[PDB]
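Consider the following assembly input.
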Amino acid sequence: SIEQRSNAVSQVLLGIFSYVRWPKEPAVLQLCVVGPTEYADGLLRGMVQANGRRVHAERRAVDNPDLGTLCNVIYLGVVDERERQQVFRSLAGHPVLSISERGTECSVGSMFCLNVGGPRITFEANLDSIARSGVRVHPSVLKLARR
Amino acid sequence: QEQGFELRDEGWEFGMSSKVLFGNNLDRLNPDSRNTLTKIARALLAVDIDKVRLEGHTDNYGDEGYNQKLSERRAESVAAVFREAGMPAANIEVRGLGMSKPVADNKTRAGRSENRRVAIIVPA
């Protein structure tokens, strides 16, 4: 079910966040949901991390030039190739964790690309995208995609 | 779940220095990059990852066909290091994307340098 999947997306995102460190940790983690999505309704209700920090989420436009300073995390929906390039031009050089809802465009762009709809959520990770992100991501995060 | 919060200072091998970059028109690695790759390879195996996809890239200088081949040779050079690090040969997929998917601006020397790369992808 879509609700069931949305909650699973919320949990895997919280899981991934726990393996990430920002060079300047905010009081409130800012998440922007960008582009059409199926599984973000849970995210958008807001979350709390196990370290006590609130995650504030809202939808922002694909063509907002300040995405890189308006969030710590971007959850990227189904956007075409022009839009996708636009988004990552905006993010370049900002310390932003990027996660895409679908798992097919992970050659460039997002650090993590989810696969939702199987018995369990998995993801691909692009280490080059991670290296360029400006945030620290511990390799043991990769265990979340397995088992 | 959220056990990453227990992590301290060890093993953070995916930082800025972990990019796998190549010199202009080069498809071979030098000691700085091969050392970098072995550390990445060891980090992955340490967290029970035994399967990767390697995607090679070029900047946009020259014709498309030449760059397609160059990108494949780059991915092959990285695969060799993964094999020698202990990753099973059959678990390493190699792909060349040529000049088609730049991560940086080809209009600058610095940007072209960033584009000459192999991206290590850890599949689901």
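Strands of chain B lie at 52-56, 92-96, 118-122. Ask yourself how this observation constrains the way the partners meet.
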